Swiss-Prot record:
It is found in: Cytoplasm. SUPFAM superfamilies: HAD-like. Monomer. It comes from Lactococcus lactis subsp. lactis (strain IL1403). The record marks S114, K145 as: Important for catalytic activity and assists the phosphoryl transfer reaction to Asp8 by balancing charge and orienting the reacting groups. This is Beta-phosphoglucomutase. Gene3D superfamilies: HAD superfamily/HAD-like, Putative phosphatase, domain 2. GO terms for molecular function: beta-phosphoglucomutase activity; magnesium ion binding.
């Protein structure tokens, strides 16, 4: 049996992937870049703020100064942070609170494997902090998603090997990070976006302890 579950936050615990998208799209358009649509945004999910802005700039082969880059990242974060102030426990995605309670009851470790510097604040907004045994610090890893480091760190923070863990993700980059960590990925979203080579559920209500156990059993 698996010993830990390693959670992505945005798009897994709550619908904040939508808010990252809207904030990055708005930023892109302010600097005259119009290609940040939902399809392109599949390349932005899971990656750090710095990598997100770089991918957007790359889209238009645009070059900005280092000072401008810092200011643009800050502007997007400030906007995003305002957007999320009213997040509450009502915003936790279906099934997720039950899953956390069921994992806890069965002595399965719970760790956050989020790239987001806003992760601790969002878990507080949603009254979820008490369920997490550890939160991996995304500033402390040497390499961000799709590098596996954050998933490895999250497993190690709860005293479990990645190979004894399940990772839950909504992004291409995150799925790759889970694969390379040694943990077992279960994605949420569309196979058109996330692939046909791992288990994908259509919505978070499918993330039940019973389903996770069966996935684990089947390999
Ligand atoms: O800008 P933050 O809050 O540090 O978030 C970093 C990343 O966190 C990930 O969880 C999101 O999927 C990305 O979209 C986001 O860029
Ligand atoms: F959506 Al995440 F780390 F919370 F990639
Ligand atoms: Mg995500
Ligand atoms: Na709270
Ligand atoms: Na906690």
């Amino acid at each position: 049996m698996f010993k830990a579950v390693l959670f992505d936050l945005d798009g897994v615990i709550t619908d904040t992937a939508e808010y990252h998208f809207r904030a990055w799209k708005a930023l892109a358009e302010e600097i005259g870049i119009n290609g940040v649509d939902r399809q392109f945004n599949e390349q932005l999910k899971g990656v750090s703020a710095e990598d997100s802005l770089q991918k957007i700039l790359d889209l238009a082969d645009k070059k900005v100064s280092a000072e401008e880059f810092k200011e643009l990242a800050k502007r997007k974060n400030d906007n995003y942070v305002k957007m999320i102030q009213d997040v509450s426990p009502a915003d936790v995605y279906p099934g997720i609170l039950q899953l956390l309670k069921d994992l806890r009851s069965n002595k399965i470790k719970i760790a956050l494997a989020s790239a987001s510097k806003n992760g601790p604040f969002l878990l507080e907004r949603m009254n979820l902090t008490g369920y997490f045994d550890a939160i991996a610090d995304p500033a402390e890893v040497a390499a961000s998603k799709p590098a596996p480091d954050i998933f490895i760190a999250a497993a190690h923070a709860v005293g479990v090997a990645p190979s004894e863990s399940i990772g839950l993700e909504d992004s291409q980059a995150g799925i790759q990070a889970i694969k390379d960590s040694g943990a077992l990925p279960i994605g949420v979203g569309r196979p058109e976006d996330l692939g046909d080579d791992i288990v994908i559920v259509p919505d978070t209500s499918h993330y039940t302890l019973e389903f996770l156990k069966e996935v684990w059993l089947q390999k």
